[PDB]
Design a protein around this ligand. Structure first.
Ligand code: IOF
Ligand code: IOF
Ligand code: HG
Ligand code: ZN
Length: 258
């Protein structure tokens, strides 16, 4: 009665309502490190998050989004394979019920515990609504999470999850610094793709970081305690909200490093 990740409304069914699901530039994809083309013309990424203004965190029934004020060029992404300035609008995660799965993208078929997506829209389009209608409208920075040591910068997010346990719940979330979620290196792979959830619009330039960040078992456990359902409805734990790898088709994955 609406898409989800369940047996009856999961990824295998999305194509019925969103035919683009079987499109030419769908995400995520498997990154085969041996076939990725090192491209020397790729410029380094420019991540300027020092003026980032987070405002709210909400459980939307599919994942939890941390939203940022994108009214001005406060937190932007430029450089890399990008042409123009991209403003950060929100970030969310995809994760699994077990540590051996959770990521959307895979590297040489290897799945990580989770995947962080920092969503940005191209400023030349005026608003996000217009950007999703363009081939280069969005830029998503993907970061893999592996279970190991705790990530201090992630704890503030972890602590607030209790207040947004169910669908539709939101909590004020100001003064969060997204710089605390970045790995040391900004080396990346890039390819043209799409949103990984319906409407599955093919308007995204994907930039997937090579270096994952570590999070503790305890930190990822808290993600698994969220609910897909709203208050008063049957409880369904929010886990495995990831889409399986899609055919690469006529696309080439470029790498910024040798
Ligand atoms: N400036 S703000 O904090 O008041 C604000 C925050 C989030 C959104 C939003 O998520 N729209 C949906 C949405 C988000 C995306 F990231 C997209 F790519 C998209 F197409 C639609 C809009 C405004
Ligand atoms: N996991 S990910 O990075 O690929 C991803 C990022 C953002 C969104 C999103 O904003 N959906 C809202 C939304 C509502 C609409 F009505 C739209 F038209 C639209 F494009 C997006 C979905 C997936
Ligand atoms: Hg598009
Ligand atoms: Zn995502």
């Amino acid at each position: 009665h609406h898409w989800g990740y369940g047996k009856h409304n999961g990824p295998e069914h999305w194509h019925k309502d969103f035919p683009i699901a079987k499109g030419e530039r769908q995400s995520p994809v498997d990154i085969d490190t041996h076939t990725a083309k090192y491209d020397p013309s790729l410029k380094p990424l420019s991540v300027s998050y020092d003026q980032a203004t987070s405002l709210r965190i909400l459980n939307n029934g599919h994942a939890f989004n941390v939203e940022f004020d994108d009214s001005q060029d406060k937190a932007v992404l430029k450089g890399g394979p990008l042409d123009g300035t991209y403003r950060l609008i929100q970030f969310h995660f995809h994760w699994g019920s077990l540590d051996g799965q959770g990521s959307e993208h895979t590297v040489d078929k290897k799945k990580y515990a989770a995947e962080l997506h920092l969503v940005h829209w191209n400023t030349k389009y005026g608003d996000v609504g217009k950007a999703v209608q363009q081939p280069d409208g969005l830029a998503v920075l993907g970061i893999f999470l592996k279970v190991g040591s705790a990530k201090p910068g992630l704890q503030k997010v972890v602590d607030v999850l209790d207040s947004i346990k169910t669908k539709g719940k939101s909590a004020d979330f100001t003064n969060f610094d997204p710089r605390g979620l970045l790995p040391e290196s900004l080396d990346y792979w890039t390819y043209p793709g799409s949103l990984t959830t319906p409407p599955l619009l093919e308007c995204v330039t994907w930039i997937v970081l090579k270096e994952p960040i570590s999070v503790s078992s305890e930190q990822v456990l808290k993600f698994r305690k969220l609910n897909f359902n709203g208050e008063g409805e049957p409880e369904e734990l929010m886990v495995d909200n990831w889409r399986p790898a899609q055919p690469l088709k006529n696309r080439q994955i470029k790498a910024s490093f040798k």
